[PDB]
């Protein structure tokens, strides 16, 4: 009689070689580029002077910078992981080094003549995996045949683990800064993400599971099992109205860019990033407050604050279809989100082109074109969402930057007028290299780096969408102001920050036009 | 009482025309169509109206076949000038889009070197607003991505200019497809009909099933003055068919010419690169359009070239194809329009866009979409893919004009799909230069050696032998050579035995037979059992 649930606040943190698993560590090409040109430099730089990294991590303004949030005591662990990563990922570092070295060579040497000679001189890690081509101006680009790369022998479950923890989410270290080294209260269990055993682990969130059977499946030493039992409880988790049986449309804003739309017949989840800590003063909606079945999960783009492998892995058997955008195969920074999801065990993945629609009970959903927020890189894995359910029209644009009002004019011509606009106002994002640094074979200038930021719409540009779509309500979302997103989004915005000032300008101009408008802060359940 | 239930005459050809130009894939896609109207079609017509004799001089030269010269001659000058003035009025929005697109692309290449591109959208000309996204590659080179899904809903993307040319002349008389516009001429009756129009499906039904002539002419809005002449393309007799269906327990393969190959079990049919003939000739032992089964489960399109993507063959097969399989396109390249979107404008929504190594299950087997390299002048065109086919134990690999530049690539494929029994390879290893096909899409002219260095070239003897060694086929068949007569107007001259393509193919078939394999260069139609 060992039927146990996961404790409601037990966090299942997925780790790839102790680094928090975000999308680019799951796709192999970007993972190799991140091991060799992000993780190894930060780990080696930490070993040389741990004091340097605490000093940068102490200054809260540069919270996301390339420095570990670890302390001098963890020096032994960092150096060990740095050496472990050298031997474990030897094929990865050879691929990343060979891939970038090829890319530098082509820029210098290929000027418009035939590229047939290149395939003869391809290094072994790239042989049969890369196609060399030109644009219409004799600039070479490297196109990875990702489907063949995913079947390479070094694309395995090695390094994939899970970190059980009971600490509050505000305690999480930054996802790209800090590896999850061994710590008290943190129990790391080796487990491939696509493994069936994970499905048994995800079942214990909402359904009772035998503890000994689960601990046996999870290869848990019996000496460590008393400590592993701490993450489990006999009581079932409390859930705040997961289902909805009204004839209307219920929208639940779960924080940042996570918003669930629900009729009594369909559920649509946009950019799932959830919390497992309940805290009533903030009136949180948690992972448990989601319905048992989510018909459609919509992934706007491939950023860590909209693509949470932690949330998706525990929601695997509960998701009818994941809706993703198409990727640009000719760009290293744009891996296919299907495949990345396939490696996480997801085959219910629909790649949607622009203006592609799916018919839903009492309505439809359309994948909309989106511009920007990717440092002006030819990344195409971005799309907005038009949602129609029982007469109510919704448009979620996430961090899309409305550079061209005529684009949304053309969009409204097909999908019609929208009732509720969800727009993100992160208009001062990180520079290019903060995210796409390890993928650059040749470094970029600081003026170029600071001009192309991960920035969305400001007040003026967001007003273009409102004018074109004629919404009665405009909701500013995807601001990252809730507490449990600090470890992914960064600092909470003080009222003087441009993102808060511009957002305040936008809500005011909307109300001046006679619409309902607000900046979402804290979780909210709305009926409409 | 005047009961005239009629079929289409077996040798009646229905030539789809977009402003009297033979409609191939790039004239159907609007952006490339606009670029071809302004930067290929309009120049050739103006060049014809000024000294048409120059065009007669090049059209006499059999070497300069397909060159930028009309195969019309001087009597058609009055007709050509009208079309040159007519298309100028009709395609005003098209030329304005093409001029703005190339001028924009020229501007960004000159000035945008790595700083933010946000200013570009404010200075976008009206033909491009809301339709193009400006972006960088990883080396600060700007690219233009047309939102093709939005462009296809633009106001000038309509059925205007789309017609069909009924003619009874042998395919042997056809003018080159992009050389020469189909001006009004005797024996050619041009009927206005949009390609995606439902009425087109009714006309295609008249190929194999009888329809009332008066009812058919009424739908196609044929004026009663023209109906006596329209009756010439129709016959009361039913068309003759050479064993179209297959109910045998084996696998029947039928070679229809060039790269068109039909594979058939008793339970599924797969058509590769449909390019058919409507002229019967038993002396050549032709397999014709009518010899295809009534229903084609799967039509597989290797890539987006005129000799493998025939709107003529596909339009009459509408409603007869379960699913058309196409490769994915790179939206950041002008020369790579989406083949799904091009087919949607032809009335096909049963279009499955297949990624690399994507497989679909078939009765008694499956097919896999294979990676393919080259034959696109080293341009970032991704709308190309090979086909692995397994049916009742028989394994096929159709590679069309694939250039095996990387032997390990096919090694990796064989690790997944297994050994192949029958390989279909093209040895067109001296194709046309880059500008012959993608000329109007260059914002800045390209140098002549670079143009001739990167040709529409496939596998030669060595590279095709790389595939054979990697896949271990018991049979190797050289196809997609353009050796059949009815492929003039698309492929060009027949290759004499001294031409590089024939010498390399003969060398390859020789090395195959020396190894104990079966090999031949497919010439003329063939029905094979396996
Ligand atoms: Fe983002
Ligand atoms: Fe974001
Ligand atoms: Fe071709
Ligand atoms: Fe060909
Ligand atoms: O950001
Ligand atoms: O070709």
């Amino acid at each position: 009689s060992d039927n146990v649930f996961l404790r409601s606040h037990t966090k299942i943190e997925p780790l790839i070689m102790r680094w928090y698993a975000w999308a680019h560590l799951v796709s192999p090409a970007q993972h190799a580029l991140n091991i060799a040109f992000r993780h190894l430099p930060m780990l080696k730089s930490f070993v040389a002077s741990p004091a340097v990294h605490e000093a940068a991590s102490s200054n809260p303004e540069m919270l996301g910078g390339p420095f570990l949030e670890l302390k001098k005591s963890d020096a032994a662990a960092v150096k060990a992981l740095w050496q472990q990563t050298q031997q474990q990922a030897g094929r990865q570092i050879a691929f990343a080094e060979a891939l970038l070295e090829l890319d530098r060579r082509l820029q210098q040497s290929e000027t418009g003549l035939s590229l047939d000679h290149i395939y003869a001189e391809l290094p072994e890690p790239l042989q049969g995996l890369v196609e060399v081509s030109y644009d219409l101006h004799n600039h070479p680009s490297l196109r990875l045949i990702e489907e063949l790369l995913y079947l390479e022998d070094w694309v395995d479950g090695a390094g994939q683990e899970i970190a059980f923890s009971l600490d509050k989410e505000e305690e999480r270290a930054f996802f790209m800064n800090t590896p999850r080294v061994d710590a008290p209260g943190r129990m790391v269990v080796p487990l491939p993400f696509a493994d069936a055993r994970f499905d048994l682990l995800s079942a214990s969130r909402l359904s009772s599971v035998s503890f000994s059977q689960l601990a046996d499946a999870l290869e848990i030493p019996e000496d460590q099992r008393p400590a592993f039992r701490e993450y489990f409880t006999t009581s079932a988790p409390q859930r705040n109205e997961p289902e909805y049986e009204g004839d209307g449309v219920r929208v639940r804003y779960f924080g940042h860019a996570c918003v669930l739309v629900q009729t009594a017949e369909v559920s649509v989840l946009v950019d799932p990033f959830l919390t497992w800590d309940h805290q009533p003063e903030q009136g949180r909606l948690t992972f448990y407050d989601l319905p048992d079945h989510i018909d459609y999960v919509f992934l706007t783009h491939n950023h860590q604050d909209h693509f949470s492998c932690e949330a998706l892995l525990q929601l695997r058997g509960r998701i009818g279809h994941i809706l993703v955008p198409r990727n640009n195969g000719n760009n290293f920074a744009d891996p296919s989100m299907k495949l990345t999801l396939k490696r996480l065990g997801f085959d219910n993945v629909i790649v949607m082109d622009e203006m592609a629609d799916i018919t839903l009970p009492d309505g439809r959903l359309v994948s909309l074109p989106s511009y920007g927020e990717h440092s002006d890189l030819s990344i195409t894995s971005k799309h907005g969402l038009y949602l129609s359910l029982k007469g109510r029209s919704f448009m979620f644009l996430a961090d899309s930057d409305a550079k061209d009002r005529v684009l949304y004019r053309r969009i409204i011509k097909q999908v019609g007028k929208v009732d509720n606009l969800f727009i993100g106002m992160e208009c001062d994002g990180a520079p290019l290299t903060w995210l796409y640094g390890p993928y650059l074979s040749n470094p970029i200038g600081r003026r170029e780096d600071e001009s192309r930021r991960l920035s969305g719409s400001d007040c003026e540009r967001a007003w273009r969408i409102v004018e074109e779509c004629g919404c009665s309500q405009a909701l500013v979302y995807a601001m990252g102001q809730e507490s449990w997103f600090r470890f992914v989004v960064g600092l909470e915005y003080t009222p003087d920050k441009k993102q808060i000032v511009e957002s305040d300008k936008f809500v005011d101009r909307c109300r001046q036009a006679g619409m309902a408008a607000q900046r979402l802060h804290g979780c909210q359940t709305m009926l409409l």
Side-chain angles (χ1 to χ4, degrees), chain A:
Chain A
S1 326
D2 53 332
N3 271 357
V4 312
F5 300 89
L6 270 166
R7 304 245 281 213
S8 53
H9 60 299
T10 288
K11 277 108 212 147
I12 290 69
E13 210 165 31
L15 311 174
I16 310 178
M17 291 195 297
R18 295 326 184 79
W19 302 94
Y20 182 90
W22 61 290
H24 282 209
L25 305 194
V26 182
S27 45
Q30 295 69 20
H31 184 218
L33 296 153
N34 276 308
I35 291 154
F37 306 124
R38 182 194 309 267
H39 292 167
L40 296 189
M42 275 174 342
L43 293 177
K44 189 209 195 324
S45 162
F46 193 82
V47 168
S49 205
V52 161
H53 296 234
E54 315 166 311
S57 300
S58 82
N59 188 1
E61 299 136 63
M62 50 159 324
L63 184 80
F67 301 92
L68 278 78
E69 298 182 344
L70 287 187
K71 319 292 159 199
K72 312 145 149 286
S73 328
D74 280 326
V78 172
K79 192 196 200 120
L81 174 68
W82 168 48
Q83 304 175 307
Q84 273 169 47
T85 302
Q86 267 152 0
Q87 50 112 56
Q88 275 193 58
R91 282 152 327 177
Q92 278 94 319
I93 301 138
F95 177 87
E97 284 184 297
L99 177 66
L100 285 208
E101 180 55 44
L102 193 42
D103 201 33
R104 327 195 222 215
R105 295 169 32 199
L106 313 187
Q107 303 309 298
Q108 312 278 268
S109 75
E110 282 328 289
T111 88
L113 296 162
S114 156
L115 317 149
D116 308 22
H117 68 288
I118 280 146
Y119 297 97
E121 64 222 50
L122 284 200
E124 278 205 307
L126 310 183
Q127 276 166 22
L129 283 197
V130 302
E131 176 175 28
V132 173
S133 34
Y134 285 122
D135 61 21
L136 306 185
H137 307 94
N138 302 319
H139 309 283
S141 72
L142 257 199
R143 203 195 95 68
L144 266 160
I145 293 86
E146 266 183 306
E147 285 84 351
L148 292 182
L149 173 62
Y150 272 84
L151 317 156
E152 203 82 328
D153 37 17
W154 60 270
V155 181
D156 50 350
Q160 304 195 335
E161 294 158 290
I162 281 136
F164 284 75
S165 149
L166 284 167
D167 306 300
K168 268 207 144 103
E169 265 146 1
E170 291 78 22
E171 280 172 66
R172 302 161 164 258
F174 203 72
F175 83 105
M176 197 131 74
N177 264 0
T178 312
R180 271 43 159 175
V181 306
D182 281 1
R186 161 181 319 159
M187 189 180 153
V188 177
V189 183
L191 175 56
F193 296 156
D195 201 306
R197 287 131 71 202
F198 204 119
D199 289 353
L200 168 64
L201 200 276
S202 301
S204 34
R205 276 269 186 240
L206 299 183
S207 337
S208 209
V209 155
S210 158
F211 174 78
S212 50
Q213 149 178 339
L214 164 145
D216 263 42
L218 266 58
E219 311 199 314
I220 306 289
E222 155 80 317
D223 348 329
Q224 270 230 288
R225 290 203 187 188
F228 190 61
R229 177 68 181 66
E230 262 278 272
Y231 306 110
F232 292 93
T233 175
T234 262
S235 324
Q238 275 235 299
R239 311 213 273 162
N240 177 37
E241 325 216 29
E243 278 337 286
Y244 170 76
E245 323 203 290
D247 203 359
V249 176
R250 186 173 73 164
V251 316
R252 280 184 133 165
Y253 159 74
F254 278 76
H256 193 51
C258 189
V259 47
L260 162 76
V261 191
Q262 231 176 335
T263 70
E265 286 88 26
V266 79
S267 295
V268 187
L269 194 49
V270 179
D271 296 359
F273 204 108
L274 321 154
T275 182
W276 287 259
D277 289 314
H278 272 100
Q279 181 267 310
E281 314 172 354
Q282 293 179 309
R284 292 188 191 184
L285 292 169
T286 73
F287 164 91
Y288 297 98
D289 303 350
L290 279 174
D292 279 6
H293 181 51
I294 315 136
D295 311 76
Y296 294 100
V297 167
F298 199 87
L299 293 181
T300 63
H301 58 305
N302 192 260
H303 284 161
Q304 81 282 345
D305 55 323
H306 309 80
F307 195 172
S308 179
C309 302
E310 185 181 334
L312 275 295
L313 275 173
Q314 303 172 64
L315 278 188
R316 183 192 274 139
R318 299 161 60 177
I319 288 169
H321 288 106
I322 305 206
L323 311 177
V324 283
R326 188 86 68 168
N327 79 306
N328 181 329
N330 272 294
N331 199 321
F332 294 173
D334 197 2
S336 207
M337 299 172 63
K338 92 198 163 283
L339 267 68
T340 325
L341 278 169
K342 186 185 194 183
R343 181 109 168 284
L344 303 155
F346 284 95
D347 298 87
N348 46 334
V349 202
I350 313 185
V351 159
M352 313 201 34
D353 300 307
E354 292 154 317
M355 313 302 297
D357 90 338
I358 299 179
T359 329
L360 322 174
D362 296 299
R364 74 204 199 102
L365 75 83
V366 174
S367 163
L368 301 168
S370 146
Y371 285 9
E373 209 248 353
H374 284 248
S375 302
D376 278 332
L377 292 181
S378 34
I379 290 183
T380 58
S381 296
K382 337 166 298 313
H383 63 163
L385 171 67
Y386 175 82
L387 182 50
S388 155
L389 282 183
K390 288 184 177 166
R392 283 68 136 178
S393 336
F394 303 76
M395 254 192 39
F396 310 85
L397 301 189
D399 306 25
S400 70
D401 180 32
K403 295 156 187 245
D404 198 323
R405 81 137 46 91
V406 186
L407 166 80
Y408 291 100
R409 196 200 299 286
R410 303 171 157 290
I411 281 173
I412 304 316
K413 232 206 289 173
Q414 314 298 324
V415 314
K417 162 239 85 194
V418 183
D419 280 324
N420 313 280
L421 167 84
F422 287 80
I423 195 42
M425 281 219 48
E426 172 59 286
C427 53
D428 207 331
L432 191 159
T433 44
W434 181 83
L435 202 47
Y436 310 112
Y439 313 127
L440 295 192
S441 78
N442 297 314
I444 208 167
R446 289 304 101 165
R447 292 173 298 165
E448 292 94 332
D449 196 32
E450 306 256 60
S451 81
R452 292 137 69 165
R453 308 187 90 86
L454 308 178
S455 301
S457 289
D458 80 322
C459 169
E460 203 56 70
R461 288 191 297 287
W463 188 238
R464 309 162 160 177
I465 318 163
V466 166
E467 269 178 9
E468 290 318 306
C469 76
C471 45
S472 306
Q473 188 166 33
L475 296 118
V476 176
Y477 82 148
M479 287 306 270
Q481 288 326 285
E482 287 88 31
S483 278
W484 61 95
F485 305 117
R486 90 168 63 148
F487 90 111
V488 152
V489 317
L491 216 175
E492 289 105 31
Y493 287 152
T494 36
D496 70 297
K497 287 297 254 212
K498 189 186 157 180
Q499 306 94 329
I500 283 297
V501 160
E502 288 292 303
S503 155
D504 290 357
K505 260 191 260 169
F506 175 80
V507 168
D508 197 31
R509 186 177 199 151
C510 276
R511 276 168 193 171
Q512 288 170 343
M515 315 137 68
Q518 84 182 258
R519 188 184 60 81
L520 278 314
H521 199 291
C523 310
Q524 188 185 345
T525 290
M526 307 173 17
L527 254 288
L528 64 170

